[PDB]
Design a protein around this ligand. Sequence first.
Ligand SMILES: CCCCCCCCCCCCCCCCCC(=O)OC[C@H](COP(=O)([O-])OCC(O)COP(=O)([O-])OC[C@@H](COC(=O)CCCCCCCCCCCCCCCCC)OC(=O)CCCCCCCCCCCCCCCCC)OC(=O)CCCCCCCCCCCCCCCCC
Ligand SMILES: CCCCCCCC/C=C/CCCCCCCC(=O)OC[C@H](COP(=O)(O)OCCN)OC(=O)CCCCCCC/C=C/CCCCCCCC
Lengths: 56, 174, 459, 99, 603
Amino acid sequence: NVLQIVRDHWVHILVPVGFVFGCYLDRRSDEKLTAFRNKSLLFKRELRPNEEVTWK
Amino acid sequence: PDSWDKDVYPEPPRRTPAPAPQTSLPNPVTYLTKIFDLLVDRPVTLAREFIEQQHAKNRYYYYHREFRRVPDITECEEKDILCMFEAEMQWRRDYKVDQEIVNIIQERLKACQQREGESYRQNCAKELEQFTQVSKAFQDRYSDLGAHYSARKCLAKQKQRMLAERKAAKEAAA
Amino acid sequence: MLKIIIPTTMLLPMTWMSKHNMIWINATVHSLLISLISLSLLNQLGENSLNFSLTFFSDSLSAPLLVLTTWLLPLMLMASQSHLSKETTTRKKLYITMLILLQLFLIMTFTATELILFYILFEATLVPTLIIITRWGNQTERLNAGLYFLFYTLAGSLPLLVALVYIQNTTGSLNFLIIHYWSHPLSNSWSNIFMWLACIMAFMVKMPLYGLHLWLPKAHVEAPIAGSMVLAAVLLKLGGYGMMRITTILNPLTNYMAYPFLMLSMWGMIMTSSICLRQTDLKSLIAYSSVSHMALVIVAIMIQTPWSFMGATALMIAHGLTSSMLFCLANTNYERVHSRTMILARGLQTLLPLMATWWLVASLTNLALPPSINLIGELFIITASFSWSNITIILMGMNMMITALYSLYMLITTQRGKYTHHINNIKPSFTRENALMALHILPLLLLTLNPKMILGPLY
Amino acid sequence: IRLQEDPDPEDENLYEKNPDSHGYDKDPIVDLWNMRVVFFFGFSIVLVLGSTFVAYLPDYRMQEWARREAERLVKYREANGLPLMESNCFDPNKIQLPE
Amino acid sequence: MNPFASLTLTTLTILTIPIMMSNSNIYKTNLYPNYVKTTVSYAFTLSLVPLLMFMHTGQEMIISNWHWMTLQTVELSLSFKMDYFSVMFIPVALFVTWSIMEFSMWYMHSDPFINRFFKYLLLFLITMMILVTANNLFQLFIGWEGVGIMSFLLIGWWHGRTDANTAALQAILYNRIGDIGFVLSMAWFLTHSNAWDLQQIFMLNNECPNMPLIGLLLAAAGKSAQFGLHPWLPSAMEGPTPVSALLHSSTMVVAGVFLLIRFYPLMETNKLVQTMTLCLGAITTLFTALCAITQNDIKKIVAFSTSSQLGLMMVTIGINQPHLAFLHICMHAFFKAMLFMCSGSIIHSLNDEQDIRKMGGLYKAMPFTTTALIIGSLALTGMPYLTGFYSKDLIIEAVNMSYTNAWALLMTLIATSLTAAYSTRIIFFAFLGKPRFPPLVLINENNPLLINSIKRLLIGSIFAGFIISNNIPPMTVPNTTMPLYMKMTALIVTIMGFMLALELNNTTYYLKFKYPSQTYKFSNMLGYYPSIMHRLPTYHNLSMSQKSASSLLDLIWLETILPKTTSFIQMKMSIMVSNQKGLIKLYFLSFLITIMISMTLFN
Ligand SMILES: CCCCCCCCCCCCCCCCCC(=O)OC[C@H](COP(=O)([O-])OCC(O)COP(=O)([O-])OC[C@@H](COC(=O)CCCCCCCCCCCCCCCCC)OC(=O)CCCCCCCCCCCCCCCCC)OC(=O)CCCCCCCCCCCCCCCCC
Ligand SMILES: CCCCCCCC/C=C/CCCCCCCC(=O)OC[C@H](COP(=O)(O)OCCN)OC(=O)CCCCCCC/C=C/CCCCCCCC
């Protein structure tokens, strides 16, 4: 029945949720390297009225 | 056409002689050109008119990115990693721009050779000299840096060249 | 890089928790999905690399190799499911686990930002390969092949570990960005000569260099089909990637220390092509062709010019694809007649037409046929070698002639002529085998269409 | 004989039981769906979608940007009589040679 | 826009179109050969239009439609050069291919893979068009190798024939030597000029040097079967008669001559390379005609005639007459294609017999092929107003009137005489006399396809020379003033060859028998070149491939040095260490020695 389909095809979400978790951890790693955000001589600028950070 | 800059990509004025027939025989080239214009040019022109009308309704724009100048490897202190990074990136961008300048000059040279045709050795002497000068400068700049080239290595090469020139001038004055 | 790394570590439990008859389907589908995800790494910058975090970074050299690895995994799955029909469920899952671990180690190797982590991962790649060879090889010689492979690699690589820790002690860091920015010239001394030797010899053994290559026929001939595919397509490219990475700190000593390696590479390229001319085994012929192509790549890396590195990258990608396809074709033939002798099966064009077409296309790509990326890389390497010296053209021309000779010799021997009369068990080609060949060949032609994606950072 | 060993089994043909076999699995339904997933995902998804994605990858290598910058520099330098390609990459005034 | 570029690219694209339909029900049916032939005819007319455009005002163009990749300062783009050479050779090649395809519709009716045969012919045509219209060295090399592999595939059409496989691989080998030369030229040009396109190559190479020009000459010799790399062309007769007629003789063996023509400014700038080209062409034409005059296989005779004409073209290039070589390319394509078609009709009508010793009586047995072959042989030998007259006569006049190599001039004249000789041999042994074929007479040449194809290539063999010569602009200064005997030299030597060969052939009817001469043995066995040069170098290379590289080095000494010696040393040391009797007296004496040594030698 429906239960057996979920009982057998529940492994098809492992790789997608791993991809989602990898994207989340990539964001987490990126947010720790924000010490020169809007501080490089090349890309330094004044913030727009409705923004807090240049990138995330 | 306004697509490209006529000054950056010069074209000599086009001088086309007028037809001066000497026979009563019809011109098959003229007849086939009329057929081509009737059968191909008009349909493609109508199709492009429709496509451009569709494009004009959804006009939107894209921009050319501007980079401000940053201090170079000469101004950077020793093992000042951030300044070295900025200077290296700027040097790489300038290297790409110079490569494209050389490409533009080479395109000029090829176009002039093809255009002048059988009189290219004389009429293309102006584009050959510009190519010679541009290639000489580009070679002196980035001739033998290697696979792992960098702004530091290019600066060392320039320093070596300057030392050689100074020694030559001193020897000449001696 | 975690968005690609984590899905492989999730391929593992999915493989171990799927049903007995669904392991191949699930592994193939999710490997293809991971390859599609990894296709996003090709969007590289013209100035610098993609620095995701402190541990991983991607470049125009790493991206095509990662895409090639992720694309190669499902093809290996198809071949393995071909030849592992009677295996138990646990051993099937163990084989899939070995393949998954190898892919994960290769990804982390290509994206590692430090030389010591790169060393750890590129040495970790040995264990799954050794297990696969010595466990699922068909013949007795698999044990000797594994011993040769392991000991060649380790005797090459241990001095590299010593040199890496010494360089870290001397300079303060093994981070690739730091060692590239803070690089200093290498003076002509015995100590610097031996440091250069340690690094270059490790990667040369990995290449392999001529005179250090017997392990390659040993392992490639005796490994299973998936092992043969991964050994030639990707594992031979670790040496080239490493040499293109370490040579930053080895200047200007590379101008003087590269002569013996260049001479070995050129002459052994000629010699291995000639050996290919007289091979009674098809797998051995493919392996020696791989040796010749990697010798050409070594020549490119040693001459070390921007035109040589682009050719090296293109030739590495092209050789990976072509050698994988050739091994797959030879393995289908072996699965037919249960023997690797080239002259045993003949008339295979009149017995199997579309496989004859696949053989023809694979052989035409094996030799440098324009405008294939094989020819693009080979021609760039030949032009750089011509700028280096003007007798390298003589050597390259000889090698190209012999390459065409042995490729067409293999094609004519296997496909043309009249069929063997007593071989009457050659069933029609399977949809799986045809799909394997198509998936091997189409990306190569698309890369020919778009060539700037495999020309490396020097483009 | 020196052992109690099994005889070497005969080669198994997938077409005998299933004439329309794709060569994936002994089970007909499993083999058919293996063929379907392989063909669909690999060919359609990976080949077509990845190929068009790579074809339409944005110009992050700044090839066209470099060409436009080169056009501007050539125009400016040929308008003012300056050399099109400068002789030095850096400033000799900012470079200090040893005595 | 000017219709010139559009129509040229349209001809190329419509040539490529039927290949896309090779995965369709039409490819699965029997209408595919007619479909391909119709497409080729339409392409022929569509290419005739730009020829009219050029012959009016001399319009020439280059079209760089698609940009491929930029290696820093070098840009490679898909560029086509639509100049006099391209716009003249495209319609001629299309006309020849159309005729050959109709002749193959008749000729290859019983082939199970006639659709694949026509697909391969169209692919060869596409690759040859790429080679001809290519504007840069990389695209020229694409066309080069494409026609090479198509020749390889079509020579080995019957895959079960070991001789066919050998001929295909031999052609590949010689063309790969030529490609060695080609790649040398490409590398030199890129390194020394930062370009692979003809415009910048011509601009920068005001005095082109020996290395690039000799690379080009080597490639041309390899592709055009000059002496040293010649034998693959006669061996290429293993393929079906349509392949021999279209690919090799008419359109593909002229690839080397065309390559040398495309770099005629550099060839003008050089002199030593011109001398080398002249000498190579002279020896090639003389040797190949000398081999031709004594062959008993009609396809072999026609192949050696093609090789001799290629040598004559190379002679023409060597005397700094690039445009005369192109004119001869066109005329030779016409009449040599027709001659091959006539020989193929003879072969088909006599049940796959290719021996003139078994032919005979065909003058009245086969009327139309007889008249077509007579017209072609008259055009081949330079009948005073036929298609071959407008090129060969001017070539001979230029050779006699220039500052040339005396031996090259003499060999060219002797080669013209031998051309007349072997044409007489073909006619005499194939058409005159009494039948020598089996009694069951199956001769029937009444097929409209064959008749119409030979007709179309027959009108060109009479009138095309006049039209082409009178419509092209003057590109060289004529040799108006010359002695009368030098003016008539070509005709005189042609007639002398005719007469001597006719007398020698007439002596065969005598009831007189004599063992052959050494000169006859040398000429009939192709100068012994294929024997020695196909048995000795091949044996030595294949023997060194196994005895030295494989066994002696790979399997013996590379194993002995690094891995085997180390393993032996480790085994010996392991045995030495582990070989102990387990005696406490022995190893306690060892302990005492160790203690004494540590006490004394260590401080
Ligand atoms: C190291 C040397 C390097 C030399 C490099 C230079 C080579 C130059 C070659 C010149 C051309 C040689 C042609 C003959 C060789 C092939 C003979 C052969 O096998 O024929 C069988 C073959 C028949 O095949 P088959 O049906 O199997 O018959 C079996 C044989 O009957 C079976 O009977 P067989 O086996 O007895 O038949 C052969 C026998 C019969 O063939 C002939 O007699 C052919 C005679 C051709 C005409 C030669 C005299 C031309 C006189 C022209 C006078 C006017 C000049 C212009 C000025 C006029 C106003 C002053 O020939 C000979 O015994 C010698 C013929 C001449 C050889 C020349 C090369 C010498 C090599 C070294 C010396 C060897 C000497 C001893 C021989 C070997 C040991 C015994 O003959 C033909 O198909 C016709 C041959 C061609 C006839 C016309 C040739 C015209 C062009 C040459 C003459 C020059 C004309 C003017 C040119 C322009 C000047 C400005
Ligand atoms: C620049 C480097 C290359 C220089 C030349 C190297 C020569 C090396 C010879 C190749 C080694 C052969 C390996 C295997 C080749 C394929 C196997 C083979 O032997 O095929 C034999 C095959 C069959 O013989 P048949 O006559 O058809 O008899 C059939 C009867 N049923 O014959 C061949 O194809 C062999 C031909 C090889 C020719 C070798 C010499 C070539 C001449 C080169 C020197 C001339 C240079 C030209 C100068 C040009 C001037 C600018």
